[PDB]
Design a protein around this ligand. Sequence first.
Ligand SMILES: O=P(O)(O)C(O)(Cc1cccnc1)P(=O)(O)O
Ligand SMILES: C=C(C)CCOP(=O)(O)OP(=O)(O)O
Ligand SMILES: [Mg+2]
Ligand SMILES: [Mg+2]
Ligand SMILES: [Mg+2]
Length: 299
Amino acid sequence: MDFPQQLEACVKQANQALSRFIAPLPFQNTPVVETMQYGALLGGKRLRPFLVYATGHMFGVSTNTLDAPAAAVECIHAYSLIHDDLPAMDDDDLRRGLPTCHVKFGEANAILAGDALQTLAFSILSDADMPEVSDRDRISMISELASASGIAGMCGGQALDLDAEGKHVPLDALERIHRHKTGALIRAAVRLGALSAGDKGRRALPVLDKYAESIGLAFQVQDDILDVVGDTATLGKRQGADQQLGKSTYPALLGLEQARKKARDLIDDARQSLKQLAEQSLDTSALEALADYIIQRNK
Ligand SMILES: O=P(O)(O)C(O)(Cc1cccnc1)P(=O)(O)O
Ligand SMILES: C=C(C)CCOP(=O)(O)OP(=O)(O)O
Ligand SMILES: [Mg+2]
Ligand SMILES: [Mg+2]
Ligand SMILES: [Mg+2]
């Protein structure tokens, strides 16, 4: 019922999960591991873990087993931001209210920490305790995180994003960028939550996919909107960063009003998909509240 309290509960759960998977690693208290801990744990809304937990919870899977996919997806997410902020990429000096990884620890440490966080995601999925999760479903989790994170998803989208700098690409190309760079990982969170539930989760996938696809695109449209109108102290990252690099964005192409409308229509579409699940007596309340927050949030 109370969404801010659920978000904070999720932040604590996910941070604990991440910390536990990071703690047995060697080279604690050296720069690369400290970079990983800074970039993964210090700040962030943990909405992808939120998606993993909320989805798995719908099928009655234990929060403790969901710690694994929640932490894995957040490792990929964390890695993606570390590399995204690099000078050769978006060259941003602030994130989550603090110096970016490459500023505080140097570029080499940032590259390697992001590299290692990606690897850790796959160590988590292959090694972590998930008692109710069949090997078949664990393999599917790994396969999904891989396809969603790599050239067919997030990385591919990062390449499209970089290519579209200064090119003011049309809506169809814009959507392709956003769905890959941001949509794909968000859909992986939902899929990993569902796969944790086995066959019952798999049966929901056609519908959860449509939900995930809509909130995932909406997530990036809101990110672009926030880049224009948000305050740096609230965002935790610099307002007007996109405009400075000439990024193809929703607000740059369509203006702020039409971008907002696109985000709102995507969320209404996400809500519609969830109605199909609520019909089968699955509790969609956390997923609908998350869907609304994705476009109501100011950070
Ligand atoms: O947090 P950022 O840098 O505004 C962003 O959302 C970061 C990001 C990195 C990787 C994939 N998706 C988004 P971006 O696309 O560079 O606008
Ligand atoms: C994929 C995108 C839009 C990058 C930022 O995601 P978030 O806005 O979830 O960033 P944090 O909460 O993790 O800082
Ligand atoms: Mg970027
Ligand atoms: Mg960026
Ligand atoms: Mg952005």
